[PDB]
Paper text:
Due to preferred orientation of particles for [name], the map resolution for KCC3b‐WT was limited to 3.64 Å. While this structure was obtained under K+‐free conditions, we see the same configuration of the N‐terminus in a lower resolution structure of KCC3b‐PM in presence of K+. By contrast, the maps of KCC3b‐WT, determined at 3.64 and 4.5 Å in detergent and MSP nanodiscs, do not show any electron density for the N‐terminal portion. On the other hand, there is no density for the N‐terminal helix in the cryo‐EM maps of KCC3b‐WT in both detergent (B) and nanodisc (C) environments. Because we see density for the N‐terminal segment only in the KCC3b‐PM mutant and not in the wild‐type KCC3b structure, we suspected that this configuration could be stabilized by a conformation of the CTD that brings the β5/α5 and β7/α6 loops into close proximity of the N‐terminus.
Potassium‐coupled chloride transporters (KCCs) play crucial roles in regulating cell volume and intracellular chloride concentration. They are characteristically inhibited under isotonic conditions via phospho‐regulatory sites located within the cytoplasmic termini. Decreased inhibitory phosphorylation in response to hypotonic cell swelling stimulates transport activity, and dysfunction of this regulatory process has been associated with various human diseases. Here, we present cryo‐EM structures of human KCC3b and KCC1, revealing structural determinants for phospho‐regulation in both N‐ and C‐termini.
Author numbering:
A (entry chain B), B (entry chain A): 128 to 253, 259 to 895, 900 to 928, 1028 to 1094
Write the structure that this text describes.
Amino acid sequence: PTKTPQMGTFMGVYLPCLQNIFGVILFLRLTWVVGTAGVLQAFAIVLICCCCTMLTAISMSAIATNGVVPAGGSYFMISRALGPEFGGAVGLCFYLGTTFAAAMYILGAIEIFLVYIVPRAAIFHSESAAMLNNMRVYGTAFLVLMVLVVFIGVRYVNKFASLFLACVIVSILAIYAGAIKSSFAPPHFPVCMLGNRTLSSRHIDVCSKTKEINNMTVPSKLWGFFCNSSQFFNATCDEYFVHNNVTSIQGIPGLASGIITENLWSNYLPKGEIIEKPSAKSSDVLGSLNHEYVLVDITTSFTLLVGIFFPSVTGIMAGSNRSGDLKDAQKSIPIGTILAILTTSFVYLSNVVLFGACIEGVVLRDKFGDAVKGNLVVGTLSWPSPWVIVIGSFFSTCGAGLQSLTGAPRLLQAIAKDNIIPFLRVFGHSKANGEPTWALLLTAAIAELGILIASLDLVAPILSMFFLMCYLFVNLACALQTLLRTPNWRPRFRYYHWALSFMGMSICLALMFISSWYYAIVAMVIAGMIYKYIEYQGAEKEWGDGIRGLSLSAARFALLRLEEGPPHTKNWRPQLLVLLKLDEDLHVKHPRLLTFASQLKAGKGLTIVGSVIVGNFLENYGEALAAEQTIKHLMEAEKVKGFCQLVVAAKLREGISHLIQSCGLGGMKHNTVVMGWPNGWRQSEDARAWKTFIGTVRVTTAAHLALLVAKNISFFPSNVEQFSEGNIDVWWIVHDGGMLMLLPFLLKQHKVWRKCSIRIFTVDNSIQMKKDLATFLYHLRIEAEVEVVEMHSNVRRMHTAVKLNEVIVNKSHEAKLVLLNMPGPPRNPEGDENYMEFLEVLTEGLERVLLVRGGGSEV
Amino acid sequence: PTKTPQMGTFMGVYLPCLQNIFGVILFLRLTWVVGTAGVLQAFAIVLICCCCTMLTAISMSAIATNGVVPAGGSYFMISRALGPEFGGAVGLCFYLGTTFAAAMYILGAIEIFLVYIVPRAAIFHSESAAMLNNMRVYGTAFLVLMVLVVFIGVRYVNKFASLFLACVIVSILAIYAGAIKSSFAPPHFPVCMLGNRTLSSRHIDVCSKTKEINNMTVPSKLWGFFCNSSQFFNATCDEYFVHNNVTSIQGIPGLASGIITENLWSNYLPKGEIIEKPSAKSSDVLGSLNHEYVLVDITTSFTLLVGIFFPSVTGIMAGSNRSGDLKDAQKSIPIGTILAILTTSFVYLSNVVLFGACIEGVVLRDKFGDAVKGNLVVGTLSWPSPWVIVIGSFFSTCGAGLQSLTGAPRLLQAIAKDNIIPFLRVFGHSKANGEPTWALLLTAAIAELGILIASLDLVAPILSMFFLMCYLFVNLACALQTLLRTPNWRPRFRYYHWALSFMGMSICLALMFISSWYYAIVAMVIAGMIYKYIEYQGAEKEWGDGIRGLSLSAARFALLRLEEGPPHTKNWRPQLLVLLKLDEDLHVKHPRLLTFASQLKAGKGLTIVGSVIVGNFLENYGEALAAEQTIKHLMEAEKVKGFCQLVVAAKLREGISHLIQSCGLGGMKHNTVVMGWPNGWRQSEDARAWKTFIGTVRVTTAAHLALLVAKNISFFPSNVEQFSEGNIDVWWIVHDGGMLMLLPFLLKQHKVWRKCSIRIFTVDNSIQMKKDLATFLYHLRIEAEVEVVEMHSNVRRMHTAVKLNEVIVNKSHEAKLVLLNMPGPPRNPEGDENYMEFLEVLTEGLERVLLVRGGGSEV
Ligand SMILES: *[C@@H]1O[C@H](CO)[C@@H](O[C@@H]2O[C@H](CO)[C@@H](O[C@@H]3O[C@H](CO)[C@@H](O)[C@H](O)[C@@H]3O)[C@H](O)[C@H]2NC(C)=O)[C@H](O)[C@H]1NC(C)=O
Ligand SMILES: *[C@@H]1O[C@H](CO)[C@@H](O[C@@H]2O[C@H](CO)[C@@H](O[C@@H]3O[C@H](CO)[C@@H](O)[C@H](O)[C@@H]3O)[C@H](O)[C@H]2NC(C)=O)[C@H](O)[C@H]1NC(C)=O
Ligand SMILES: *[C@@H]1O[C@H](CO)[C@@H](O)[C@H](O)[C@H]1NC(C)=O
Ligand SMILES: *[C@@H]1O[C@H](CO)[C@@H](O)[C@H](O)[C@H]1NC(C)=O
């Protein structure tokens, strides 16, 4: 079944996008824009608009290539690629866009019918306000006719979309053929003009002051329109009429006439000034204000023209509105859409110059076909007659109204059916065939509200603002998801670079703000509220709570993004696991551990406090909760910011061995284990106490985590007291110098150890080390003095450990904190007593020792 | 030492804030603003500005009360309360504010000296541009004089701050005394006025056309300024002079004169229009343009006046610029600041009305004291003479320039010394006494750049924009931190409600945008870039990487915020721990477990995959890494989004018992354990396999987590196949109905089980349950059909289990998935074989069973 609807890029995405870009503006307003802007600035307008739409086409193609393309419309693709939040924001902004587009197209069909086809038939008789009322009443009647048609029989609309496109394309080819024929044989459309004041020709017949009748020089009607005598019997004619001259100016000069040089400059005359051709002669007298003087119909400006013109390039999201019936979506969609935009941009940029170079510089600024005997201005450039265009534009515009009144409610019911936003659930209701019955009424209501502003020139900025907001979000989600390395964002496109999407976002964000700085802020705040509300509803949906669940989702997303990345880090920073030992009273046997951990991390970073409770889990559940509360209160008391984890284990050694390798969620692991020294290991008769510490040392070294064994921790300073002056005597014995040097710094960054100095008692070869140590300190911009002491089984170890004792006390007996590198545990577990004796003698005579062992790739 | 500087709220925060709010604007521009705006709109201006500054005072007091107040300036308080990011953004915005304030005050001192004190002495001779050049050259000389003074001898500035405040206050009291005296005896300052055209009086002497000299009616000088004869010998006088009349209008009418009714309306005349008193008579002839006509000096508007006036209310952050020397900061600072703002607001609102009701409606719009013989306009309202004000304002304004050139570089070196932003490190360099030597040069450079725009009227909007951005960030950080329940945000204030800070943020965000929509966007983007760069640098500082560390910090902060909250949730949602069993080959023995977990959670939520590796950790480190990679590849293959944790344990039972209670970081815990059924427990000779499952059941029940034992999992559908039609036969046997009912729904929300139906085979009492079940389904808006089957040691259990088998197969033999409530494990571990036999018979004849046991507070 799918294969038959399979369509090549052309018939699948080119024609829908081509049929939806070609709107009414190209006819009813391109000539006016060219005239009041000058070909140069008109070129700037068309190019800037086409640039936003092209960069946005590139971003949307990047979205199209990423991942499998869902079978729904463009909304489903955008949703599945940018998350439901962006999906809903773009859905609603594009939907309001489509509704106000149905409003503009209905206004256009009414304007064409009323001004050009049948002027005589009007609700309000002959003045501007009357047109507005005529448009309001005529607009709603057509609006009601459109709603009823779309409600009953959309299949007929599907059938005649092709005829509508036919009408559009025939009209454009007629325009081009007329422009070409205007080189040798241009048409005979003349305009009466009085001096440099252009006259209307709806009522005048001859551009002559006196129309000879039956061999009698009776004054012509124009005399009757500038002089009230009408018989030239001592007629009182006004100043400008008597002074200046009426002339018949060829309204469409040849393509070779060279008028482009004349109309190459802006006019921008404000409301009610008479349109003046700055070529013909003129007197200077003034005061004779008359009705016949063609007037500037709106106080124009550049920023107004860009807004009036932008809704003619919107519609590229329709390229992928037929994405279910495609063969190679990620291959057909980008090329088809970009080619469609290139074609339409080529048409606009060619027609701008052709109008500039073929139509008089006065007939262009005429926004209602006056002075050309009431014919469509662009219609005058056509091969058969202006009638072909005046009817083709009307049929195309009513067809586009039907198209957008079928396309908007389907999108609304799809956004409702997705249950992204709850309150729109009412509009999810569908007809027997799945047509949105109760959404359509809302679309009609909003289109009604639009039509009430019965002027294209005032509806166009609103439509443009909504579509511009849609494009801005579509560009921003891609730029963001590319920068932040969002999961599942693989934009498999040969030309998509995040700078492109960012440049598009910036350009037509500027466009938004240019057109209106207050509508743009209103749109941005509406979109932000919808976005945050969708995020909140999703949180409440998945986690169960609003703000609790919001933070929960934030954490999960951060950890996932954190998972798909390089394991190492360019710098090494100690993330602690504090091993608190719980006594038989279930009280922390060493709070100084937490005090010191707090001082070491200085309240920032990750600190996981782990502890083992000896016993059976089946019956110590309550004790585990109580002891967890105890440790949490202790953490809060020592200003430790972090998390607590208790394991009720059968064996203390096994509990710690499981904590050391299972703590932390993946990606938020610790990398150092901070332990308390087993004070009084020899004193206790039981050998388990000292053997457990060794077991932990082996487990820590094997897991490749750093180890900081703090000894004599009962004498460690509390968070409230301070040191006036003291020396952190780092002993860089042998290797593992990175952690040893880095530690004291981190300690000195805290207020307790802030006021102390640092002395590295490194142990000719040392002098080689002296130069390296000096470089390390010179770079770190820290006040540190390095002194190099030249330094050169069990009996030998003791005989040398006593020398180490001698030197360390002789240099550092009165130090406030002695860091000290550690030796590894024995391979054979028999020599553990000898190993602990080595440590005890090595650390004898020291008030505060922090034994440190690297065992890792520390840099 | 601290006690002596202890100052009560008045002398500690009132006088610094009072001395820093009273600027130059109050003199040189309040009269002009009142005149060109009308007392009404001037009142609107003063009230709106004072409203932003008052709500911001409330927010800053809320900041002041929260936590301990650091000893530094306001920057340190703001930093320690809003994080270094907001601290740095506000610091730089307020610093640029202070520099451009030094620029405005130097411009003001020059303007006062040059226009009012010594007009004759000017660099450029007599025209507007000449004043600008005079101001540029004069400004830099004073600027260089100020820099040298501040560089050498700030102690003298500290000494004379009191004299500067004295000058300000004496001036304001002189203004009020003059206003009062103007009730009975107003002063004699007359103005010559020709018709309704006001004349300048710098050069005229008598307001008379002819000045009689020596009994001869020679024409007066004004004749020479409107007629070139100067001898009235057939003098050719212009039109307006001959038609209209010169009159002497009292320039300061009495307070009782009632002119307020006259000057109660806006003027807003654009540049160069002659200032006209709309009271006196006038002819209508025009054309006689003359030099003497006093002209509107700037194309005024409301939005311009608000910008010109705002830099007179800035300075409230100086209230807490002396926070180290206070007694009760959180008590003195709020009251002192708010009282200071009330005092100054009271002064402005009184002087607006007094000027409205005492000065002619023409002398006010005169921005350079013309027509009053070149005297300060407000100076004319004073008891002794205008000289007292003209000198007091000059001394006050040079004093404020010195004050802001000492206050800006100190703040800059403090922001540098904090090492928040790296590249500013160069400016951290200080003098011997700690004065910023190399920061001051930059402050002077920026002040120089400001002075180059030699006009207060153009510097004031920039200053106002910077201070407005500072206040907006100070309000937004408080509103945000109050809403999101940010840790350590305890605003102990009796009147602070987040709606107040939000209203302040909105009001003067509107102020920002009103004054300039392009400067405001430039300021916002600058602040956003500084904020994100500070955040990035902090990330790189603490975690070691830029983007890795950024996501790491985001995760830690989310979990912490997640920690201080209610433990339960209004809704229950299953967060899974999938227990994968690793075989002797270290391969996942049941991938269907992951398949089903993926289907159950549907890719959203938290899924922690735990598994135990039997062995010793010291030597299976490599195996643990390999098996972790294996399980990660498996997770990615089954579209499971989540984390993996392996524990190398000595006993499989103990490894699982430790995983069940230690998985997840605090706050991101699981709440359900998903296990695979021990298929073939009887077949295996070893009893360990079945006994371990029971051990896990007891541990799961005791930990109060839900349990989902999936049986016959080898037949569970894969993620690619689907079910055309089928029945999820939920058996709500007895209790724990919330989880049982909730599960199938979550399953049906996935595409695999999307196309299946649901049948609840609940087991008169049931009919009571029928009504409850119907209500539960009616609310959930899900298509579900409920059928109620009426239903009524070891031998009895088997004799009834076979009945359960009979019924369940008779109803559901051909079901696609049979959910089934579970019975608890025996209390005595001897009956475990009987317990497992009960389960096996109860589940006999079923292709797919999901045994479910609640054991928790599920709602
Ligand atoms: C149609 O003819 C009228 C009749 O003069 C044109 O009006 C006048 O055009 C001049 C341009 O030369 C405008 O500027 C004037 O320029 C002279 C040059 O010296 C200067 O002396 C004047 O003071 C003035 O600036 C003038 O404002 C304008 N109106 C009047 C009342 O003179 C009109 O511009 C012609 N149409 C077009 C499209 O040019
Ligand atoms: C100072 O005196 C001059 C001399 O007339 C005033 O100029 C003229 O004031 C009138 C206000 O009445 C302006 O509006 C005119 O109103 C009449 C009312 O019918 C209307 O017929 C006119 O068409 C016009 O709209 C007028 O524009 C203005 N200028 C001229 C050239 O007449 C001037 O307003 C006086 N100063 C003040 C502060 O009022
Ligand atoms: C009107 O026409 C006459 C003769 O055709 C010519 O001399 C005159 O200059 C024209 N008027 C103007 C304003 O050029
Ligand atoms: C000028 O003064 C004369 C007499 O003092 C008076 O009649 C005339 O109305 C005055 N001019 C105007 C414009 O009122």
